[PDB]
């Protein structure tokens, strides 16, 4: 199957909402060992977010029930075993994504944009692993997520403008990592607030197209801060 052919199938799978097929197609394009184009990179990101998202949502629903069932020992036990099955599927998806990043995406990344995008993706997926991590294992996994986000953060500050959407997106995710994983409300608010204000200074230098793109993410930063500050 032609790399070009697999990408057209991935776009087809996205239209049909067969994200399982979309991820398999994008995994095959990545495995060919060539560096991904921006469009191919976006398809791989959307594919795995939808595949991992189904399980994160399922995990949250089952966790809710598992808690609320303080009035039944067997039902609570059933919820726990099901949560564990969902957690196993989630770990496999995350491990599969992290394997693609280390074996092909991060090493072959030539531009800083892609390097930051892959490093941010590595932080995201370790964060997902941290949410369902065993108590002893969690501290190590949390540190791996932080290290990947931190490297992406350092590269974006040096090589990218404050208005860049990938830089802006990384700040939103990294600030969320501090809030929900490290339970650091201060660092999380300061990280988002700084990213937002630095973006505000360069809004005048932006074209009409980069404007929608930047202001959309800046609003997401403002929405989070409002949630956290009020």
């Amino acid at each position: 199957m032609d790399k070009n052919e697999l990408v057209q199938k991935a776009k087809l799978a996205e239209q049909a909402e067969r994200y399982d097929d979309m991820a398999a197609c994008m995994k095959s394009v990545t495995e060919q060992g060539a560096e991904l184009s921006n469009e191919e990179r976006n398809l791989l990101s959307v594919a795995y977010k939808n595949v991992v998202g189904a399980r994160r949502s399922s995990w949250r629903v089952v966790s809710s029930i598992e808690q609320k069932t303080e009035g039944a020992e067997k039902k609570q036990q059933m919820a726990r075993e099901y949560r564990e099955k969902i957690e196993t599927e989630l770990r496999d998806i995350c491990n599969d994504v992290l394997s693609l990043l280390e074996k092909f995406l991060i090493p072959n990344a030539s531009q800083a944009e892609s390097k930051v995008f892959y490093l941010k993706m590595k932080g995201d997926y370790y964060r997902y692993l941290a949410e369902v991590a065993a108590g002893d294992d969690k501290k190590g996994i949390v540190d791996q997520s932080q290290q990947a986000y931190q490297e992406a953060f350092e590269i974006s500050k040096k090589e990218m403008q404050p208005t860049h959407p990938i830089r802006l997106g990384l700040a939103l995710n990294f600030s969320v990592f501090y809030y929900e994983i490290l339970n650091s409300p201060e660092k999380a608010c300061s990280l988002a607030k700084t990213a937002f204000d630095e973006a505000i200074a360069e809004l005048d230098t932006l074209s009409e197209e980069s404007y929608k793109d930047s202001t959309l993410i800046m609003q997401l930063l403002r929405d989070n801060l409002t949630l956290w500050t009020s």
Partner: peptide, 12 residues
């Protein structure tokens, strides 16, 4: 208690 925004976001 509510979901803070992260990117990429779901369709949904």
């Amino acid at each position: 208690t509510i979901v803070p925004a992260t990117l990429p976001q779901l369709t949904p």
